[PDB]
Design a protein around this ligand. Sequence first.
Ligand SMILES: NC(=O)C1=CN([C@@H]2O[C@H](COP(=O)(O)OP(=O)(O)OC[C@H]3O[C@@H](n4cnc5c(N)ncnc54)[C@H](OP(=O)(O)O)[C@@H]3O)[C@@H](O)[C@H]2O)C=CC1
Ligand SMILES: NC(=O)C1=CN([C@@H]2O[C@H](COP(=O)(O)OP(=O)(O)OC[C@H]3O[C@@H](n4cnc5c(N)ncnc54)[C@H](OP(=O)(O)O)[C@@H]3O)[C@@H](O)[C@H]2O)C=CC1
Ligand SMILES: O[C@@H]1[C@@H](O)[C@@H](O)OC[C@H]1O
Ligand SMILES: O[C@@H]1[C@@H](O)[C@H](O)OC[C@H]1O
Ligand SMILES: O[C@@H]1[C@@H](O)[C@H](O)OC[C@H]1O
Ligand SMILES: O[C@@H]1[C@@H](O)[C@H](O)OC[C@H]1O
Ligand SMILES: O[C@@H]1[C@@H](O)[C@H](O)OC[C@H]1O
Ligand SMILES: O[C@@H]1[C@@H](O)[C@H](O)OC[C@H]1O
Ligand SMILES: O[C@@H]1[C@@H](O)[C@H](O)OC[C@H]1O
Ligand SMILES: O[C@@H]1[C@@H](O)[C@H](O)OC[C@H]1O
Lengths: 335, 335
Amino acid sequence: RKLGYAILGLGYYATRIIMPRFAECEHSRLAALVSGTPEKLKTYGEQYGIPETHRYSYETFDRIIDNPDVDIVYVITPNSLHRPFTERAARAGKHVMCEKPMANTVADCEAMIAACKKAGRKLMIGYRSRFQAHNIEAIKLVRDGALGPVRTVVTDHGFTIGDPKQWRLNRALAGGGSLMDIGIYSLNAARYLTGEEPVAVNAVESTDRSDPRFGEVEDIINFQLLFPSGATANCVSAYSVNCNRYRVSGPKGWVEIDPATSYQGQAMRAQLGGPPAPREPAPQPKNQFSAQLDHLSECILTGREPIVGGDDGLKDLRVIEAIYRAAREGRTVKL
Amino acid sequence: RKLGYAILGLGYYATRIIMPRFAECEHSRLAALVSGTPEKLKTYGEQYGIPETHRYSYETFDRIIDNPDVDIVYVITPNSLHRPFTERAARAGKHVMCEKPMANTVADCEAMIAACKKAGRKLMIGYRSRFQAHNIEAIKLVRDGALGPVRTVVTDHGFTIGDPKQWRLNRALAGGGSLMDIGIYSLNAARYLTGEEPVAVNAVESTDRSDPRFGEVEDIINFQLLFPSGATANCVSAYSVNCNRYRVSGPKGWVEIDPATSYQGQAMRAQLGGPPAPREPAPQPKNQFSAQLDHLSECILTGREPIVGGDDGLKDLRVIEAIYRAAREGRTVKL
Ligand SMILES: NC(=O)C1=CN([C@@H]2O[C@H](COP(=O)(O)OP(=O)(O)OC[C@H]3O[C@@H](n4cnc5c(N)ncnc54)[C@H](OP(=O)(O)O)[C@@H]3O)[C@@H](O)[C@H]2O)C=CC1
Ligand SMILES: NC(=O)C1=CN([C@@H]2O[C@H](COP(=O)(O)OP(=O)(O)OC[C@H]3O[C@@H](n4cnc5c(N)ncnc54)[C@H](OP(=O)(O)O)[C@@H]3O)[C@@H](O)[C@H]2O)C=CC1
Ligand SMILES: O[C@@H]1[C@@H](O)[C@@H](O)OC[C@H]1O
Ligand SMILES: O[C@@H]1[C@@H](O)[C@H](O)OC[C@H]1O
Ligand SMILES: O[C@@H]1[C@@H](O)[C@H](O)OC[C@H]1O
Ligand SMILES: O[C@@H]1[C@@H](O)[C@H](O)OC[C@H]1O
Ligand SMILES: O[C@@H]1[C@@H](O)[C@H](O)OC[C@H]1O
Ligand SMILES: O[C@@H]1[C@@H](O)[C@H](O)OC[C@H]1O
Ligand SMILES: O[C@@H]1[C@@H](O)[C@H](O)OC[C@H]1O
Ligand SMILES: O[C@@H]1[C@@H](O)[C@H](O)OC[C@H]1O
C-alpha cells in the first residue's frame, strides 16, 4: 500500500517543500532521514515521528540496506553529490528518486543509470512539473492537435540569486550555473511540450565576472533548439532576472503558463480560435509534489517504468553539454 | 503650419491605415497621390479631395519636383521598390518617409541614405512603435533605471500569412520572408529597449518548403542577440504562428507588452517590486501613426534629425544580414 521514503539531504527543498507533502500521498510514507547534520536528525525526526533507528548520518547511510521500512531513497543534495548518493542507495538495494539536475555530466548520469540497473532498482528524476495540472493540460492540448504542429516554444526560467557563498555558485558542488539549476526547466519543458529531442543547439552566455556571485559559474545562458519536426525553441536561463514561463505555439493557436513551473500559482492562457482567454486545467487527484512521490511508489508496486526515469535526466544532460559547447565554441552544435 | 505628404503606393497600409490618420496630424497634410493604378488615383483622389494636378503615376512621378505643395514623399510599396522610389523622391527635392524594412540589403540602405544626403533632404523610416504610448513607457522604465541594467529581451513577432501569391512571399519583391516583414519588429525592439547595437548573432531557420507559401522565402527564423553591456535578446520571427510581444527584464524587475507593436490594443504588465500588475503608460498627444507623420514634418520645420532616421533602418539591415548568415552557416556571427 505505502512504500517508505528515506529523505537524504535535509535542506530547503527537502524540509520546506517535499516532507510536508507526504500528507496527501496515497502510496508513499516518510520512513527515514539521512543527514550530515545531527541536529536536523533530532529536529525533523521529532517533528515527523521518525525513531532513532531510522535516522542516518552520511557515515552510517550504507546500513540502510538492513532497514526493510525503506524502499526508496530521495536524494536532495547539491548536484555534484547526486551520483555518489544514488549509487550508494542502489547498492543498499533501494529504489532512487533523484532531484534535478540529475548529475554534472552525461557520463555521471550513465553511471547512475547503470548502478540502478545492476541493483534491479528503479530510478526517477524529480521533474515535478510532469505532475502539475497546468503543465499536463498544455501537453495534452499539444498532443490532441489543438495547436496544429508545434512551431515555437518560447520559455524563460530564472531567478535573482543572492548569497555568493551558497553551493549553487560553487562549481565543485553545483556542476554549473543557472542552466544546471533553473534553465533546465526551459530545456525540460521544450522537450515535453514538443515530445521530441533536439537535433541542433545554439547558445549565448552573458556573465559579469566582476559580480561576487559569478566567479565560477554562469549567470545567463540562453539557447535555441531545433527539433526533427521543424519545431523550434528559444530558451532563457538566468541567475540575474526573475522569469518562469512558457508559450507553445502552432498555426492554429497557442497556450502559455506564467508562472509555469513554480511551486504554486500557475496561471494558463490560451489562444485557440479566438482572442486569448484564461484556461483552467482539468483537476488532478493531488498536488504535483505528492503526485511525484506516489508516481515512483506506484511504478514499483505495478512493475512499470517512471515517466521521468534516469533516461529523461540523461537526455537533459546531453543537451546541457551541447548548450555549454555551443556557447563556448560560438557555433551550432548538432545532436 | 502643415507640410504636404505625397503618398506613394496605394495599397493596404497606405489606404486603410495611414491616410485616415492625417485627420489627427498638427503639422502634416495629405497633398498628393502616386499610384500605378489609375482607378485608385481617381477613387482616393476624389475621396480625399486631391486634384488631378496632384495625382501622379509611377511614370510621371518625377514631375513632382515641380509641385511645391509636396514636401514629403511617403514610400509604401513592396520592399524591393523602397530604394528606387526613395532615390527618385530625393532627386525630386522631396524629404522621404520610407516604410520598413528600409530595403533588401545594407548596400541598398546605404545608397538611399547617400541619395537623401546628396539632395539635402531628410530620410525617416516608418518605425511607428517609437511613437506608441506603451512602447515609449517601456523605454522610459529602462532609461529611468526601474529594471536595473537590461539583462534579457524576449520578443516574438509573427502572423499566419495567407495567400501564397502575394508579394511578401515573392523573393524578388519582398527581399526575404518573415524576418523582413514582421521579425524586424523583434529586432527593432531589442535595439530600442537596450539602446544598444548587437555584437553577436545566433540564428535558427525552420521552413517547410512543401508549403505553397514558402517556396521562395523563410517562415520561421529565430535569433539571439548579445549586446556590449551583456544584455541579451531571444527573438522569434514567424509566418506560421501569431505573436506580438516583448518582455524586457533586469535584476530589479521587468515590463512586457502583449500585443506590443500592433496597430492598437497594446496592453502592458510590469513586475516592479511586487507581483506582476497592469501598467498604464503616460498618455501621448496623438496616436502612433499621426505622431509618426508629424515627427518628420516637425524635424523638417525645426532643422532636427528624425529619431528613426535612415541610419536606424540601416542598423536593422546590418543585423538582418547577420541573422540570415548565422542561420545559413550555423555559427555565431560577430558585428
Ligand atoms: N524540483 C525542485 O523544484 C527543486 C529541486 N531542488 C534540487 O534539490 C537539491 C538541493 O537543493 P536545496 O534543497 O535548495 O539546497 P539546500 O542547500 O537548501 O540543502 C542542501 C542540503 O544537502 C545536504 N548536503 C550534503 N552535503 C552538502 C554539502 N557539501 N554542501 C551543502 N549541502 C550539503 C545538506 O543537508 P544535511 O544538512 O541534512 O546534510 C544541505 O542542507 C539540488 O539538487 C536542487 O537542484 C532544489 C529546489 C527545488
Ligand atoms: N509599419 C507598418 O505597420 C506596416 C508597414 N508595411 C510596409 O508597407 C509596404 C507595403 O505594405 P502593404 O501596403 O501591406 O502591401 P500592399 O500590397 O497592400 O500595397 C502594396 C502597394 O504598392 C504598390 N506597388 C508598386 N509596385 C508594386 C508591385 N510590383 N507589386 C505590388 N504592389 C506594388 C501598389 O499600389 P498602386 O496600386 O497604388 O501602385 C500596391 O497596392 C511594405 O514595405 C510593408 O512592409 C505594411 C503594413 C504595415
Ligand atoms: O492600456 C492598457 C489597458 O487597455 C489595459 O489592458 O490594462 C493595461 C494597459 O497597459
Ligand atoms: O546548504 C545547507 C543548508 O541548507 C543547511 O540548513 O545547513 C547546511 C548547509 O550546507
Ligand atoms: O514544518 C516545516 C518545518 O519542518 C521546516 O523546518 O520549516 C518549514 C515548515 O513548513
Ligand atoms: O551536512 C553537510 C555536511 O556533510 C557537509 O560537509 O557540509 C555541509 C552540510 O550541510
Ligand atoms: O533554485 C531552485 C531550483 O533548484 C529549483 O529546481 O527551482 C526553483 C529554484 O528556486
Ligand atoms: O505592376 C504594378 C502593379 O502590380 C501595381 O499594383 O500597380 C503598380 C504597378 O507598377
Ligand atoms: O504584414 C504586416 C507587416 O508589414 C506590418 O509591418 O506589421 C503588420 C503585418 O500584418
Ligand atoms: O528549414 C530549412 C532551411 O534550413 C533551409 O536552408 O531552407 C529550407 C528549409 O526547409
